[PDB]
Symmetry: D2
């Protein structure tokens, strides 16, 4: 199997009027991420896929359509984290046996779980699935204990703290760190991350690779300049409602983008003009 | 079609090792709330019931068992809110048909939902269930808009703010306000709440009701004294892990309180004896 | 000597064009708080007095005028807190010998001071003045170590937390607790405070005594109603800029109440009509 | 005059045990930064020099000694921000007459000042001194309004947010941006800052230069390794109390670094060995 370096699209998901998965749309979006946007993998059933709004079978369904839509070279990570540990294990099992290269799982939220409970949450999932696990982000000393598990191969780092990122990069040199913040990709890149996961790479993945490459290939100034342009895109998208707007941009490419699953509201058409100017300026 | 003032137990729920509901153990906890603690009703599948760790079928299960557990004298509120809007509607109808007096739904969390998305999450559930709804706590202007809908009969108020609570109370003298903070019951009472929902009422319902009545009768210094050592209990139980420690205190009464659902951990025995020291001091 | 319980006006201060103190205005305001509003005492050079915008000379200046405006029976608390400990001790001495019945000092802010540095800040001021001290903002055990000192007679309690207030009151029955949140007086009173310090008592002093008295006598419903009324007032002045607005209300009584000290801005005349209506509705 | 690109020490200040400035030790700390760490300039009476613990005459004192101690080619920025706008104007005038190249002012704190009050605080100081101003503490238009002023030549940027920093660098390509976070120099550098202001540069100024230089020449990976080194130094120093520990390191170079001003506590000797190890490991 792989090491999981590279740039991943946080897979977006198209729905009908009743919060049901549009599979033909979903296949188009996965294929847009690899063939058109030229990314290395898909990060399936994360935040960006409106995962936590779904029921278990929808999650399995998305896991299914995504894996079928792409070649064997395409790296795949499966987010299975859920407040329902039994569900996590079940999705973990289902995903592992579909051939997903690694699992990852959101930290137990809502309740104020203790570190110990958070820790044995990950360990229980690994134990029942025997797949590689990527965690979320916790102190250095607590990472230290998590990464002591041979099956916890790394972290999806989403906290915009570049002091903590550097301490983590220095202390765990042989561990996978993927950054989760699109608008600070070039800062993550020189801070030594091994790749990135991103909702906006569904639309802007070709610029993201240049940032990631130029910044490691010395050409930091040009990389920055491309981060300037991407942050124009990101700030605009964030301002209209990020997921529906991204899917609105993909619809413009002849993709069946469907709707957001409620309680997410659809793209508000009062934003239509501004979005078309954005689509025109950066050619999306 | 009944009155909703009063003190509620937020139903605690017993599980086995595989995180399955201990059916018979639940029945007891239900009855312990009504008969021994003498509470006006049951708040079912709220956060205290570990509800967000469950799948839909367990949630229906807890709904039926809690209902068949109690008399009709007993007010029943069904917490039905979930990130899955479809699931909330399904639970909503199901709880309504079972005869729960009002529905109730947590604020859609995890994502940064706009206020209009939050508003139409409630309106969608009300529409599909045609049952009275109790919301969580969002500004006063926004409350005004939400309370404008007729089938929104009030709010379960958990925010530490007594300025805002006073403003709501004044601005909506005809809507129901149940407070959610056990350790400040005496302050919510004289702020004119219509009742309270609590986890610690499973154990301490009789000091709770006396806090509630004595305060309304202006016997306030007495009511306070009771808060002053209901807070002993609460401070203690929080420092040990509130839901497993609470269900520990019920085991000490012959109730089959089972285990927490993982990733919640079982009560840690290193506390066991500060615990029953307290069960002793306050006769729990 | 003096019993420090009671209601205190946090003393507003009038300035001229250049930021220099209006002593005649100040004396009127001082007298208004005792003679007109019938308060047991003054709290001089607190936040409400724009104290932290002042130089040392001016702070003394205020301390002197406030002493010379009232009678011997009038309780007088001096806030001398400052990031400059040399300054605090200089004012601490000056105010103690003017005859102020106690000193108060804000917790050292801006820098992330440790508890030890904070503790010994308070102890250093007492040792140099031998006067009584009221602490002004930490852990209940920290309170213990602070209140373990005989010359720390109490705390000006400002944080809107009624669990923590309940704990401090149970744990230190012999210590003085004055609350600083006017809009939650009634809740503070039934929580056993010995009195209160408020900016708005300069203007709504008489309703505050009634709130404080009625609450204690079990006339809780009438107390809460006067809280409704007073919160209309409080909410309104907060929305117009509280210190400039409070002072505007005072000018209506013919008190030469002057200007805020820059960079505070003068009362915006666009709020004039709404303020005049507030004044008329509540007879201010 | 000079245009203020480059690296500045946030000038540390030595005190006797009564909190009076050790002027000869200060003169030594000043030359240390320029002659030994080879920095481009001094940032004087910022928070690293314990400015907000001082009185006005001490502040002028530190402005005076620091200017005397250095050659005319040294860039000098005077922090004259105070809550007392009269004090700030006075200090700004003084530092300007002494010859300081620019003033700088902390945003008004402690009170909830509006944006307008903040804007006109800066505008008042500028008009009274006719010196260039460097702002620091939030919107982009709020930034754009301040930056509209030709005397506000830039900003000491201390918020560790690299989305906003990028947004400002793009929107104002011609303004001066100096970063204030030493532990993220390399991330600041590639984000296009014109330089940096730092307390630890008093001790690590040469490594900081190399980070700033190497990154801009696109040798990002060796710049980053030097950031790894500097963060060891910064993390250790924060864990021991940063200002006292920085001055202890200076003392080891024969500088009379004296004592922190109370309520700051002096360096704790239980940290001596760990500090000696750091000094040895990094040749400090
Ligand atoms: C919370 C979130 O959606 N963040 C996403 C980022 O791609 C974007 O920067 C974010 O959507 C907007 O900045 C990304 O990390 C998604 C996340 O990896 C996931 O699990 O889908
Ligand atoms: C966080 C929490 O569970 N709060 C509970 C309160 O009764 C208590 O004050 C809490 O358990 C202890 O602070 C209660 O509001 C739970 C809530 O009502 C529910 O839906 O179960
Ligand atoms: C921060 C502040 O000025 N709070 C005041 C309260 O009286 C009022 O509740 C506040 O002004 C309006 O909520 C009062 O505590 C003043 C303060 O104690 C002081 O030292 O002057
Ligand atoms: C609050 C503080 O001391 N920050 C300093 C930074 O150099 C360091 O990164 C800070 O010490 C944390 O490491 C520095 O920015 C101080 C500031 O520039 C000043 O005005 O002295």
């Amino acid at each position: 199997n792989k090491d999981l370096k590279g740039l991943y699209a946080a897979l977006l998901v198209p729905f009908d009027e009743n919060g049901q998965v549009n599979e033909q749309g979903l296949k188009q979006i996965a294929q847009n991420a690899i063939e058109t946007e030229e990314l290395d993998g898909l990060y399936v059933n994360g935040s960006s896929g409106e995962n936590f709004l779904l029921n278990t079978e929808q999650k399995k369904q998305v896991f299914k359509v995504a894996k079928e839509a792409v070649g064997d070279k395409v790296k795949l990570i499966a987010q299975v984290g859920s407040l329902d540990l039994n569900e996590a294990i079940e999705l973990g099992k289902y995903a592992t046996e579909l051939g997903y290269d690694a699992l990852s799982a959101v930290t137990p939220f809502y309740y104020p779980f203790t570190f110990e409970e958070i820790r044995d949450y990950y360990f229980d999932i690994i134990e029942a699935t025997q797949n590689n696990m990527i965690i979320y982000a916790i102190s250095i000393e607590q990472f230290s204990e998590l990464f002591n598990h041979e099956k916890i191969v790394g972290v999806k780092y989403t906290a915009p703290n570049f002091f903590l990122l550097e301490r983590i990069r220095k202390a765990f040199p042989d561990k996978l760190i993927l950054s989760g913040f699109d608008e600070m990709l070039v800062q993550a890149t020189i801070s030594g991350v091994d790749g990135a996961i991103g909702s906006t790479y569904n639309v802007n993945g070709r610029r993201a690779r240049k940032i990631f490459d130029l910044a490691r290939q010395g050409q930091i100034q040009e990389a920055y300049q491309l981060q300037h342009d991407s942050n124009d895109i990101i700030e605009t998208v964030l301002s209209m409602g990020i997921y529906p707007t991204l899917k609105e941009i993909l619809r413009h490419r002849g993709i069946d983008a469907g709707l957001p699953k409620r309680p997410f509201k659809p793209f508000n058409e009062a934003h239509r003009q501004t979005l078309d100017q954005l689509i025109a300026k950066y050619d999306l």
